[PDB]
Coordinates of C-alpha atoms in Angstrom, one line a residue:
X3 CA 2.5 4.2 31.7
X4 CA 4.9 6.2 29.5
X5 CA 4.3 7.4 25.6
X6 CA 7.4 6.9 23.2
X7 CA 8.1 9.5 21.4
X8 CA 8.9 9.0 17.6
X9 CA 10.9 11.5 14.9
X10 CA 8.0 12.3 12.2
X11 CA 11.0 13.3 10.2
X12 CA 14.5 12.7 9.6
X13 CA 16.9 15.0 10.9
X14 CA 19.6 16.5 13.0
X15 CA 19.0 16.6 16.8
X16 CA 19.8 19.3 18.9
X17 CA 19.6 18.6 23.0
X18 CA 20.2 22.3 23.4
X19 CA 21.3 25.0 26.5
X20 CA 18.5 24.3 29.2
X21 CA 18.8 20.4 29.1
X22 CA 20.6 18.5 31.8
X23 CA 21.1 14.5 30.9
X24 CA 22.8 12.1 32.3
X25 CA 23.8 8.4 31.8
X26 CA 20.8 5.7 32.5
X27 CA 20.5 2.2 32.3
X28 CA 16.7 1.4 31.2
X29 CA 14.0 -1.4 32.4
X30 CA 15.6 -3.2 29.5
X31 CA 19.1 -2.8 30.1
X32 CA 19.5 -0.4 27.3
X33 CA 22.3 2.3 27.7
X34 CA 20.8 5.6 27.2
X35 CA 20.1 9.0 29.1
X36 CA 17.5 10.2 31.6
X37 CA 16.4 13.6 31.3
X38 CA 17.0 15.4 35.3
X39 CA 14.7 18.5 34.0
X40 CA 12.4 20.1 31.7
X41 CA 13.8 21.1 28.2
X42 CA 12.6 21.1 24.5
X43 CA 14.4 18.5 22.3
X44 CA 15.1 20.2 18.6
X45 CA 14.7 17.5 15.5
X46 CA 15.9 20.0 12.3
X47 CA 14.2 18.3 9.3
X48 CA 14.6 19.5 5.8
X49 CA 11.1 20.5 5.7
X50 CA 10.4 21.7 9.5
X51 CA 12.2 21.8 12.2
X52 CA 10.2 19.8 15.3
X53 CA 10.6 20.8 18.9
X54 CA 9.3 18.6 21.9
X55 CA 8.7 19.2 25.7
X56 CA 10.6 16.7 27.9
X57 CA 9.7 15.9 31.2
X58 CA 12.3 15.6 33.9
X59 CA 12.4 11.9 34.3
X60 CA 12.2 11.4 30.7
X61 CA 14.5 8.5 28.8
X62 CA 16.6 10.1 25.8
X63 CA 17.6 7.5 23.2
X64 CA 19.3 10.2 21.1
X65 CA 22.3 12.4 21.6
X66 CA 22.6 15.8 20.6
X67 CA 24.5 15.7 16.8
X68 CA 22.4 12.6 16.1
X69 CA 20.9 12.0 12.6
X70 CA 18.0 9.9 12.7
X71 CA 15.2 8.7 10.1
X72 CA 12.0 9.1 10.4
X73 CA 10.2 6.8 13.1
X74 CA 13.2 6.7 15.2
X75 CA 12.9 6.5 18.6
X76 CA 13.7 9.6 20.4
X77 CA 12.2 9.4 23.9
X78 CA 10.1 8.0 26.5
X79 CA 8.1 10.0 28.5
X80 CA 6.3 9.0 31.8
X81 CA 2.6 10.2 32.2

């Protein structure tokens, strides 16, 4: 009922000004963040950098400053 979303590459993420998180405990009692409105997440790759839309209601599995690798996951987002 949700699509994960995965970093193509590795890099820096960036939360950014329009994004409003807060704490949330998921499904699978994993401590992470649920997005309470729309906002791009920013993934600066070497390469490219790699904006997504999140939807309120989203989970966040990153925090902004995070370095991830490639494949990480970085949200889910309900359909």
């Amino acid at each position: 009922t949700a699509r994960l979303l995965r970093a193509p590459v590795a890099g820096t993420i960036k939360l950014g000004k329009k994004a409003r998180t807060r704490p949330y405990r998921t499904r699978h009692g994993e401590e992470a963040l649920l997005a309470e409105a729309n906002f791009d997440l920013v993934l600066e790759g070497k390469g490219r950098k790699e904006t997504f839309a999140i939807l309120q209601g989203s989970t966040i599995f990153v925090q902004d400053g995070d370095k991830v690798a490639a494949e990480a996951i970085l949200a889910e987002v309900p359909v």
